[PDB]
Design a protein around this ligand. Structure first.
Ligand SMILES: [Cl-]
Ligand SMILES: [Cl-]
Ligand SMILES: [Fe+2]
Ligand SMILES: [Fe+2]
Ligand SMILES: [Fe+2]
Ligand SMILES: [Fe+2]
Lengths: 174, 174
């Protein structure tokens, strides 16, 4: 059977989920229980966490503009996702998506992670650039597996304290 | 490093590869040596083979219209990929993409198959619907692994002969 239903018009679907493509929800997965995790991500949303994905991530910025803060070659860098850009991110490149625009919409495609292949989420010190904290997770459902993780970082000065310079990371907002 | 390069404008890329999005080439893979196989498929192209993909296939018909001839629930069916449609095909659903329109362009996303996970390509009898022939392949490079397969079916009345009714399948054109 067509487990995932018939084809359907993507722009209309994005329009009809506009109320979810903004805070507090911000994104919406298109199909459930698939190997390909296909998500539309709206805005605005800024964040301070860096994602260490053990597999590739595909981006197609359909509407509006965004950017990825990255660590590449040991430096902080930015990759801009201008409206109409596509991009393939290699495994493990640390990235922190920033989505300043309301009404923006990005197609993001990932793979289900097999058991034992963990995702990393980490924060870096704004003063000295040292790793402040890292949590690894077996990512099964982002709705339940990720928000508490971020919440526990914001709530702990211990977790936010830079082991190098002692600066306490701001937490939720940069 | 950004192994797969920086983000870039997808519509412009499609425009600049127009000469490849038509016969005899018809398609073009966006990045090489990636886990995600990301292809843009043009037209026109009709075909008689059905693909048995051991993993999912994602479609986003960016420009123009196409359709997939399918076998679902034991019947011949069609899924239309109208301009703007997206679609996720479950593993193993037999499909034969038909792309009648020049200037059309479909984003197709697949996964590298691990060793031992084979793709099937098969043809069905127009008279009685029985399986006429099936080849399984370890799909590594579609440029070298698939054209000879189709070529050997067209060249063999033996391969094209229906074991049920004896009808010799037409081969290349329906
Ligand atoms: Cl994102
Ligand atoms: Cl196709
Ligand atoms: Fe990510
Ligand atoms: Fe620090
Ligand atoms: Fe296929
Ligand atoms: Fe037959």
């Amino acid at each position: 059977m067509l487990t995932y239903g018939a084809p359907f018009n993507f722009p209309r679907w994005i329009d009809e989920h506009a109320h979810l493509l903004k805070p507090p929800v911000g994104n919406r997965q298109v199909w459930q229980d698939s190997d390909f995790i296909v998500t539309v991500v709206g805005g605005p949303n800024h964040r301070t966490d860096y994602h260490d994905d053990p597999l590739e991530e595909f981006f197609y910025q359909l509407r509006g503009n965004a950017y990825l803060n990255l660590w590449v070659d040991g430096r902080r860098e930015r990759a801009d996702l201008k409206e109409g850009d596509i991009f393939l991110l290699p495994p493990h490149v640390r990235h922190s998506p920033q989505r300043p625009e309301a009404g923006s919409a990005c197609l993001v495609i990932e793979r289900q992670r097999p058991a034992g292949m963990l995702d990393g989420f980490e924060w870096y010190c704004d003063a000295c650039g040292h790793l402040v904290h890292r949590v690894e997770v077996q990512l099964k459902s982002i709705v339940t597996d990720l928000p508490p993780l971020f919440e526990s970082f914001y709530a702990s000065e211990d977790k936010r304290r830079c082991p190098h310079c002692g600066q306490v990371h701001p937490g939720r907002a940069a």
